[PDB]
């Protein structure tokens, strides 16, 4: 009874019917990662992507032009946490792609390894994102960097990681929480300051979108790193 519509982002679908859900094709059929419900069409199974819990899902539903996470792409994911959003990213990139999930917390790390056991295209890295040199052996050159660390010098952390592992012309997607950067300043003032700091390194922000319906005081910035001449 379900009808499925293609989404503008490759690898992403939208599911209607009894459920109003944004979905991705399940890489491991018959398995649920964190209790999300699944639907089948005929042969093909999809997993619901919760926008209330995830921030990338909120950005996609918010009307973002580009996410740059595509099938067969290498993604470096900073701030993996338990891996709820990581599992959907692993679905999009498919068997050809690789996801590097970096998480410093030990309790969230234990959930990643269980998820990484069932998915071959996820590479768990239990390290600190402030020191990209401490895990350079594990990560090759990547295409997209996603950062959701929610920590005051997020811009410097991304730039250090982008210089070491992000190819020329690669893209970055950064989630910014206004009250984490500065609790007392206004949200739009905080967001503009981060835009200035990105320009200081060789990062060109191309768009900015706020996550009003599912979160508050959050913004997502998509840009390119070392753009070709």
């Amino acid at each position: 009874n379900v009808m499925v519509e293609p989404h503008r982002h490759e690898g992403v679908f939208i599911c209607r019917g009894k459920e109003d859900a944004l979905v991705t094709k399940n890489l491991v059929p018959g398995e649920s990662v964190y209790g999300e419900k699944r639907v089948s069409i005929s042969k093909i199974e999809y997993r619901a992507w919760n926008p209330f819990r995830s921030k990338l899902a909120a950005a996609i539903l918010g009307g973002v032009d580009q996410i740059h996470i595509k099938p067969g792409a290498k993604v470096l994911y900073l701030g993996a946490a338990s891996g709820t959003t990581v599992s959907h990213v692993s679905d999009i990139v498919g068997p050809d792609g690789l996801v590097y999930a970096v998480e410093f917390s030990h309790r969230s790390g234990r959930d990643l390894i269980n998820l990484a056991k069932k998915r071959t295209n996820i590479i768990p890295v239990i390290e600190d994102a402030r020191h990209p040199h401490k895990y350079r052996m594990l990560i090759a050159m990547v295409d997209v960097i996603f950062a959701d660390v929610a920590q005051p010098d997020q811009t410097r952390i991304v730039a250090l990681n982008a210089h070491t592992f992000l190819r020329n012309g690669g893209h970055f997607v950064i989630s910014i929480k206004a009250n984490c950067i500065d609790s007392t300043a206004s949200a739009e003032a905080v967001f503009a300051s981060e835009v200035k700091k990105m320009q200081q390194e060789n990062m060109k922000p191309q768009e900015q979108l706020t996550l009003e319906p599912y979160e508050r005081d959050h913004a997502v910035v998509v840009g390119v790193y070392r753009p070709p001449p």
Binding site: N1, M3, V4, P6, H7, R8, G17, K18, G62, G63
Partner: protein, 101 residues
């Protein structure tokens, strides 16, 4: 022009596929008009049930506190009422400060 999508699709922010995507893809599943009406009615039923459960949660939270507030009153310690009871909130009391021996 910048999004490379049709002007009508600009209105729907949640899903606005590109022109080349639209002419190379196909919507999958139920496509008949009669089924789509049945699809629309299912959305109303699920959203109404979500609305009803949320409102039940708000009332049950209030009821538990009022019973808890009444249970605190069964204490010999002196107390002063600082607020009256309402439908949304129980009455707030301040108790005299004595250490428990």
């Amino acid at each position: 022009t910048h999004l490379q999508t049709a002007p009508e699709l600009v209105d729907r922010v949640f899903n606005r596929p590109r022109i080349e995507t639209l002419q190379k893809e196909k919507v999958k599943g139920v496509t008949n008009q009669t089924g789509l009406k049945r699809i629309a009615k299912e959305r109303q039923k699920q959203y109404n049930c979500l609305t009803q459960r949320i409102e039940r949660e708000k009332k049950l939270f209030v009821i538990a506190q009022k019973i808890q507030t009444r249970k605190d009153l069964m204490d010999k310690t002196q107390k002063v009422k600082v607020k009256k009871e309402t439908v949304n909130s129980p009455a707030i009391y301040k108790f005299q400060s004595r250490r428990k021996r």
